[PDB]
């Protein structure tokens, strides 16, 4: 945790995007946290179809 601007606690998260910007880690604040889908799973699962449809637990909104 880190005290960011405006006295808000921030936490690091790795952004997943198909651009490979430069630094893929961001410091998210609580206001920007609940509108993203934050996975906590793994890529070690392969089915007869495609790997991109595998299911992992996440945290969207407050569920």
């Amino acid at each position: 945790a880190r005290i960011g601007p405006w006295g808000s606690l921030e936490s690091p998260y790795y952004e997943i995007s198909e651009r490979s910007k430069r630094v893929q880690m961001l410091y998210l604040s609580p206001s920007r946290d609940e509108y993203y889908m934050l996975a906590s799973g793994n890529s070690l699962a392969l089915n007869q179809g495609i790997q991109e449809e595998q299911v992992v637990p996440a945290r969207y909104r407050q569920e």
Partner: protein
């Protein structure tokens, strides 16, 4: 006499639980198409964490003395 078992149940020797003298197969139950969508086994095996058998200890001993003749699996 007493069957082809020699009634291994009566003695206690290793023997299949079911009788290997009837073992009547299934009578062609409903296939995947004629089933409601909740029981379908969706024709593409799904990855699951519980897909490899638990290692366990007694599964090692059972395999260990199956080779030495003390066990008939």
């Amino acid at each position: 006499e007493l069957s082809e078992y020699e009634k291994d149940k009566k003695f206690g020797r290793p023997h299949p639980f079911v009788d290997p003298k009837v073992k009547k197969p299934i009578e062609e139950p409903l296939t995947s198409e004629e089933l409601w969508w909740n029981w379908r086994k969706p024709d593409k095996e799904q990855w699951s964490r519980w897909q490899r058998r638990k290692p366990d200890v007694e599964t090692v001993f059972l395999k260990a003395m199956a080779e030495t003749g003390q066990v008939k699996l």
